[PDB]
């Protein structure tokens, strides 16, 4: 059945960040000595994962309590566990975790492994006991208190017998990337042995798939089953558990991103580069290499997006006259004047329309001026700004600092118009050129024979205040 423990008290958790972890084999092919660009669900590089200690001591006395809160599930979960006594045992998945909706269950029962999908009646605090005493023969007698009952189960599984917990720093890492797509339960998994650690360390480990489960249920929330080393009837304070819950687990949530994976000759994924993390990483992804030489490279195109859409049909009459809400100017918006649709910034114009004219076209391809139906103020439209983005870098293996040149635009509009990496536009390092706006480089009055040609008589170079400087080229 079920047993009620004490309240979780909503403890404020520490956080840690996963330095380049949790990339798995996306496809089912064998690729050797290739650099492949894969767009799929991955855990972002250098992302914050939240880590729970298995058993926390709210006081050093021995006041020990579980940390197994229910957590969301949006398009996959990277779950790592660092532990040495199989204190974590499995997971439940579902939407409501009650009798209303189907629920899936993976758990290690002592020695066997059982997977089910039923209408389990999960209570609030599932736990698996394993206590011992020297007298008689107990040696982890156990209690299995996960679900009250199960009805008309569809998927069944059991495995074979095995071993249990111990009645010492070789903590093992176990990583899983549970994702549910197309009514499946892709469980990418990998075990590794590590020693002399306290948290999850920086490292790289490609994860290989383990099993696909044909399940086909709606999944939104999941929990974690923890092995208890005690008994609620006679709960001990200290040394009852495993060193005050040093074993712990980390949760992070996948996002749809593009990665550059480096398959070595053997077909084993060795390195990865996250495109959307840095300007330098986008340069690597566009050049399809892990090292880039000195120069400037055009990565992508920056375009101002229309903020809000406005309409302006109101002729005033006949048929059904409509309304236009309001009118906004000096702002890049989507506009529909009497059915003429487009995007642009509307501004007050000094052109003088003849009384019988509606719109003008000085360029012969685009109507640069328009007459407003409500008030006869004549508005000229200008296309929202855009331009290429060039990444100025010295040698990739000299330094990882780069500068960014937005070509052919003023940069009173760069930080907000575009939505990846963020600039924050420090006041001193947004030097303006004729060729565009420069971000991440300072100004130097001195002149040198110019290394990297930026344009309009400005060239940039590297000096050990940002490491990259821009100056006006000298002729000798």
């Amino acid at each position, epitope marked *: 059945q079920c047993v009620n423990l004490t309240t979780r008290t909503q403890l404020p958790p520490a956080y840690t960040n996963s330095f380049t972890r949790g990339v798995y084999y996306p496809d089912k092919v064998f690729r050797s000595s290739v650099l492949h660009s894969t767009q799929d669900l991955f855990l972002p590089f250098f992302s914050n994962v939240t880590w729970f200690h298995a058993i926390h001591v709210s006081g050093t006395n021995g006041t020990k309590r579980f940390d197994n809160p229910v957590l969301p599930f949006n398009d996959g979960v990277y779950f790592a566990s660092t532990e040495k006594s199989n204190i974590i045992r499995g997971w439940i998945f579902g939407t409501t975790l009650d009798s209303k909706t189907q629920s899936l269950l993976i758990v290690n029962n002592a020695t066997n492994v059982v997977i089910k999908v039923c209408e389990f009646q999960f209570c609030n605090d599932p736990f698996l006991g394993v206590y011992y005493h020297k007298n008689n023969k107990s040696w982890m007698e156990s209690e299995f208190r996960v679900y009250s009952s199960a009805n008309n189960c569809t998927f069944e599984y059991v495995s074979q017998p095995f071993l249990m917990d111990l009645e010492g720093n070789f903590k093992n890492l176990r990583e899983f990337v549970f994702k549910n797509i197309d009514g499946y339960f892709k469980i990418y998994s990998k075990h590794t042995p590590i020693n002399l650690v306290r948290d999850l360390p920086q490292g790289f480990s490609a994860l290989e798939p383990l099993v696909d489960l044909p399940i086909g249920i709606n999944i939104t929330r999941f929990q974690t089953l923890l092995a208890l080393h005690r008994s609620y009837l006679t709960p001990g304070d200290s040394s009852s558990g495993w060193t005050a819950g040093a074993a712990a687990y980390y949760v992070g949530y996948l996002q749809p991103r593009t990665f550059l994976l480096k398959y070595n000759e053997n077909g084993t994924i060795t390195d990865a580069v996250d495109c959307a993390l840095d300007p330098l990483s986008e340069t690597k992804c566009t050049l399809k290499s892990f090292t880039v030489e000195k120069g400037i490279y055009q990565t992508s195109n920056f375009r101002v997006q229309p903020t809000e859409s406005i309409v302006r049909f109101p002729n*005033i009459t006949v048929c059904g006259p409509k309304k236009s809400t309001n009118l906004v100017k000096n702002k890049c918006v989507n506009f529909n004047f009497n059915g003429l649709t487009g995007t642009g910034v509307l501004t007050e114009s000094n052109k*003088k*329309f003849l*009384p*019988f004219q509606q719109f003008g076209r000085d360029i012969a391809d685009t109507t640069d001026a328009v007459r407003d139906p409500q*008030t*006869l103020e004549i508005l000229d439209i200008t296309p929202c700004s855009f331009g290429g983005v060039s990444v100025i870098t010295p040698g990739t293996n000299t330094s990882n600092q780069v500068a960014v040149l937005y070509q052919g635009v003023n940069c009173t509009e760069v930080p907000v118009a575009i939505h990846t990496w963020r600039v924050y536009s420090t006041g001193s390092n947004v030097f303006q050129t004729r060729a565009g706006c420069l971000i991440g480089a300072e100004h130097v009055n001195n002149s040198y024979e110019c290394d990297i040609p930026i344009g309009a008589g400005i060239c940039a170079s590297y000096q050990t205040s940002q490491s990259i400087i821009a100056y006006t080229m000298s002729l000798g």
Partner: nanobody
Amino acid sequence: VQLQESGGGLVQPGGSLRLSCVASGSVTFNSMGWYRQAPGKQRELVAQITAGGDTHYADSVKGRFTISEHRGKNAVYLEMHSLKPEDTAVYYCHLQVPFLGGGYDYWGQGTQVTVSS
């Protein structure tokens, strides 16, 4: 279409307002007219300004309405003041564009104004 003219606020007796003819561009004229009409009765001639400067006014609007022109923005203004409930109507401004000697004035664009307590 040609020109356009609308807008204006409701007022109470004794109030003041300055009706303005929306600047529609440069147009040839010799007499800017202001008519007033309310449901149940005909359009009536209220205020006329000639390009030379002649100021024709109805007997019912003497000493309360002032008509003027501004050629910088090419708009004729009618300042209406000392208002009474008899001014509850729509006001129409008619242009002067010569046609075949003169015709098709442009009063079609109007503004609704009601003077009540």
